[PDB]
Amino acid sequence: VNSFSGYLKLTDNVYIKNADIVEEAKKVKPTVVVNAANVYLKHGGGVAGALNKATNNAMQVESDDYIATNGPLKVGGSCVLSGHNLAKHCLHVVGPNVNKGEDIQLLKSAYENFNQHEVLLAPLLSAGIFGADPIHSLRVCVDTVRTNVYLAVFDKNLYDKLVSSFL
Ligand SMILES: Nc1ncn(CCC[C@H]2CCOC2)c2ncnc1-2
Ligand SMILES: Nc1ncn(CCC[C@H]2CCOC2)c2ncnc1-2
């Protein structure tokens, strides 16, 4: 049993809810919240900007030190950092950004990072300002992630479309 509430079950391991990933993290304090990161961990907008704002910029300060030591992530890669006031840990995952011309085949590699964690609260990778089709992102998630993932879909309109169209 876990603390996640109000989710619709899509498969054995994937659950979905119309929710802002930030308010959900604040309520649950999950072991792992996933950030929709870029390779520079520059948390300007989208899910990353919202998560970072909720940490009072502490996520960005920690991230700048990580990049100064390690250099940029790979598209499709990840790193584990603090979850600050939102979660125990934040898994920063880089999905391909279609609005920068990155290979959408890298979306599967991105979701494979989730398999290193038994339970996660996550957004749909490469959705929103990363420019991918969220229906596609949900299909790759279901077909790639084997651990238990609780997806927070911000847009109510999109949430209803994802559920209604799910095979
Ligand atoms: N502000 C900064 N940003 C980036 N780097 C590169 C770090 C690369 C890693 C990779 C292997 O070990 C070092 C910096 N070095 C010093 N200051 C830096
Ligand atoms: N605070 C937040 N800001 C942005 N997004 C992503 C918005 C993109 C669309 C497409 C997939 O889901 C919504 C969030 N998702 C959950 N919480 C979020």
From Swiss-Prot:
Catalytic activity: Thiol-dependent hydrolysis of ester, thioester, amide, peptide and isopeptide bonds formed by the C-terminal Gly of ubiquitin (a 76-residue protein attached to proteins as an intracellular targeting signal)
Domain Macro as annotated: residue spans: 1-167
Membrane topology: Multi-pass membrane protein
Subcellular location: Host endoplasmic reticulum membrane
Regulation: Inhibited in vitro by GRL-0617.
Function: Responsible for the cleavages located at the N-terminus of the replicase polyprotein. Participates together with nsp4 in the assembly of virally-induced cytoplasmic double-membrane vesicles necessary for viral replication. Antagonizes innate immune induction of type I interferon by blocking the phosphorylation, dimerization and subsequent nuclear translocation of host IRF3. Also prevents host NF-kappa-B signaling. In addition, PL-PRO possesses a deubiquitinating/deISGylating activity and processes both 'Lys-48'- and 'Lys-63'-linked polyubiquitin chains from cellular substrates.
Subunit structure: May form homohexamers. Interacts with N protein.
Name of protein: Papain-like protease nsp3
The organism of origin for this protein: Severe acute respiratory syndrome coronavirus 2
Residues of the full protein shown: 1025 to 1191 of 7096
